[PDB]
Amino acid sequence: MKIATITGVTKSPELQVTKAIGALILSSDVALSALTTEKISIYIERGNGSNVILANKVLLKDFILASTYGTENTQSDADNAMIALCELADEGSIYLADKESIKITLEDLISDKRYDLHGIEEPQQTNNLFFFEQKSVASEEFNKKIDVQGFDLAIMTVDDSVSDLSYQYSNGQVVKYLPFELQTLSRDIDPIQAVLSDGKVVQGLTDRLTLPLVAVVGIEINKSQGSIINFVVRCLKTV
Amino acid sequence: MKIATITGVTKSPELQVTKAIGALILSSDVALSALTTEKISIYIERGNGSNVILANKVLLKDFILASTYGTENTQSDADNAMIALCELADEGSIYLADKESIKITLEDLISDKRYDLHGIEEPQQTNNLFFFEQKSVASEEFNKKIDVQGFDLAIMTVDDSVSDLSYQYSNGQVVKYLPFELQTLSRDIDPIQAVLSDGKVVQGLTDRLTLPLVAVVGIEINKSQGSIINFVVRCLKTV
Amino acid sequence: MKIATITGVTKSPELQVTKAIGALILSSDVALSALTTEKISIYIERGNGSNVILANKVLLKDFILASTYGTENTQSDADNAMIALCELADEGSIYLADKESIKITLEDLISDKRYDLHGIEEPQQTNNLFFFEQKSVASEEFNKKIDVQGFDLAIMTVDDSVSDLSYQYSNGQVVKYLPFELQTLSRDIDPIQAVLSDGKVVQGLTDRLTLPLVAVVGIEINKSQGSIINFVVRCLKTV
């Protein structure tokens, strides 16, 4: 159903959804590569506190990239320059018992741009939900190690100051990769990232990289001071 | 093997094939979007018995869109502006027992256009065949309900007067869809519909929508007066 | 890791690799369709037994097209006009015990172009290796029958002299195809062959055709005298 449309204002109101939905359709007249600052926040209000957080001010570009990895890709039309379908459940849709509601908020929107949010209903119900988390670096240290066990997909920022990325697998082996090799391996599973309205296809964003994590327990970043490196990890778990 | 090449005339003769073929190849110098009124009729003729009707004056555009949904698509070359492969059986060629033949007819052709036909045979014989059926919703009526039990793929005409499309599933649940949401969901399975000669790709047709039906038993169309809504459904069964 | 960067010379020096790499990355500023005479040669020198010859002066175009069939395809970036990822092992990497090492060389390059080699390692080791072989049909031979049992992919040069090509399957059936039908069948598996820098995709080469051999035990070529035909076949086996 048509959840909301936003135009003119720089911040969407607290959008409330009561019926069970499983996926969100985000449409805009701004291209995917032109998203700069817009952020989204989605949660489920269970009652007297103890609400479930699925996304806390996650960047829209990272949210779109982390959800359209694989056979699918972002779409375009003659009326909308960017369409993306992002799922929130594994197979069916979120189940709300008595008074739970899904609250969605948009922040840092552009004044002269239009956005539209739609919700997709499903005939099934499920308790397996997707969770988004954010990790960063202090930007004043050369190297840092993070643990990515459980997560099956990551979106990393791309900068010229990142030298090495070390993957530590579940069997103890450690493999070092360069950004070029990382991008080449990334573009081997999902060759196409988006299709433009005119007909051209873009096979990758110039400053974001999608990494699938299979049997990977650790990621080490070897970089140089001067920039902040951001990772957005996606996981699936039962609430 | 090559079947026929048609030019100049507006009606192809009733071509007869005796070799057991498994699929057809349709090639023409007009793009897939440029097809307007061409119709195809394919059936199996038995010398002593009842005819087997697969397609009866089915639109060529709908036939191609039904047969080329999935990983594949319709391609193009320098000589031919449209090349498509259409499957007739499930995983083999149609088996002719005693006095069976395949009759193919093309009608409502354009005078100055070329239409070729090719046949593809397989080393296996199977009894599963694909059947095409046509359904309509009139223009003087507001809403309708059509039973789509047993089918797995439909193609609906696209008009600016359709309001809602409702799916009733096998478990009794009812889900309402907007045309925009339905198009977005349809493109979520097959991102690309055709590739042009220059290099640009077209991800859909402006007046056709392909609906993959899974465990759906009813479709309810809600619209306003002004146009006729046409559905072409495909099914698989044994003869 | 980075193996070598070749620029200015017409023959790359012999390169020795000691680490157990799993795949190679070929990057160059020459488009995929623009390669004419570049050749590669890879072989493993083993201190216990006999040396393993993987590629013996295989053309770069055929070597690249043999590895990028399926969902993957050769890509491009701003700096590099052609990037390809070619696997040398089935799932893991080549096993080297104590001193056995891989040796790679490039031949018949162009002085005013650029080439690079990258190596990709894997956390696992395997003995299943990929082998490339070359078959030839002379100019004075009207027809020729070859045994492609055990192979899984072939690359042929499209020529106007070739008239028919017949598959012989395991069950004994023989099916004859034309070049047009062969190309159409091939393009139904991998619709897109490469993506250029400006966003236009290319769905195939104008002089090379890729044939997937599934349950095929013989290939017969019928042509007219005048031209030579070359097949590049790929196979997987345990050493």
Numbering used by the authors:
A (entry chain C), B (entry chain A), C (entry chain B): 1 to 239
Text lifted from the article:
In this study, we report a detailed characterization of ΦCjT23, an icosahedral temperate ssDNA phage with an inner lipid membrane, isolated earlier from a strain of Flavobacterium (previously Cytophaga). The virion structure determined by cryogenic electron microscopy reveals similarities to members of the viral kingdom Bamfordvirae that currently consists solely of dsDNA viruses with a major capsid protein composed of two upright β-sandwiches. The minimalistic structure of ΦCjT23 suggests that this phage serves as a model for the last common ancestor between ssDNA and dsDNA viruses in the Bamfordvirae. Both ΦCjT23 and the related phage FLiP infect Flavobacterium species found in several environments, suggesting that these types of viruses have a global distribution and a shared evolutionary origin.
The basic capsid building block is the pseudo-hexameric MCP trimer. Within the asymmetric unit, type 1 trimers circle the five-fold symmetry axes at the vertices, type 2 trimers reside on both sides of the icosahedral two-fold axis of symmetry, type 3 trimers reside on the icosahedral three-fold axis of symmetry (contributing one MCP per asymmetric unit) and type 4 trimers reside between the rest. We determined the atomic model of ΦCjT23 MCP to compare it with previously determined MCP structures. The improved map quality was sufficient to build atomic models of the trimers de novo. The MCP monomer is composed of two β-sandwiches, V1 (M1–T126) and V2 (N127–V239). The outward-facing EF1-loop is used by trimer 1 to reach under the spike penton domain, and analogously by trimer 2 to reach under trimer 1. The capsid-integral part of the spike, corresponding to the P13 N-terminal penton base domain (residues M1–F91), sits in a slightly raised position relative to the type 1 MCP trimers circling it. Second, pentameric spikes are required to fill the five-fold positions via interactions with peripentonal MCPs.
